[PDB]
């Protein structure tokens, strides 16, 4: 059956194999379960906070990279740059946050961000029940929980050289899930994607970003660049 030319559809390659993704969904700790919903559900002034709580955590994050190389010096060879990636995508509202850092395992996801209490949080409860500005939130060891401030729902996808990829996601409501990630590979480091609420879409214009990052996250340490869709003609 002689041929000389195909459509696309004829020479379109047969997938490749459905790849599972192993799902597990946890409760929060009761108290940070409590603080999410105070979070969530109460007006705040000073809610732009939230992005010093993220940077300050990549931060963190890229100086484990300088230490763990004392201890494992193959980290020296890596090419990637040490930075951190403000990313707004207007389409999605979506603000995504990027770094180079150590990023987390599976366990980590699961323990540091939400089942293991943390010392201040009932604390921080009194304090903000007392009136208390909501900036306070990173003395109390609770900072990143400042991501509920602006979004919806938030998505950790990461990648640490002792684990495979994985997301962590939650919408509140008092559980999470953790799921291993076959996606795109991010390389190491985190990626926090927050879908902002629809009253919060200041935070993907371009001079907000720039304005709180000037505020409040002059002394990263690190280069942050921040990434602006080209508006379209
Ligand atoms: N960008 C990131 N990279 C790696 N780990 C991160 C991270 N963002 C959050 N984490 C993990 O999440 C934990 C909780 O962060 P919080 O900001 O709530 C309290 P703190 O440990 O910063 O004082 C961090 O200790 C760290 O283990
Ligand atoms: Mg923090
Ligand atoms: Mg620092």
Redesign the pocket.
Known sequence: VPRGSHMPEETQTQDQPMEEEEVETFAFQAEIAQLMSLIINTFYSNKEIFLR??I???S??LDKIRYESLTDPSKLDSGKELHINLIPNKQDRTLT?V?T????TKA?LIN??GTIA?SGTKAFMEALQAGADISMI?QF?????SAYLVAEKVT?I?KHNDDEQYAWESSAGGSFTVRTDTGEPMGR??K?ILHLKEDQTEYLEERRIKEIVKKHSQFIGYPITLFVEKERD
Request: charged share 20%.
């Open positions: 709580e993220l300050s955590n990549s963190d994050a946050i770094d850092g150590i990023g987390m980590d540091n961000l943390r990173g060891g609770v900072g990143f929980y950790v990461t480091g985190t926090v």
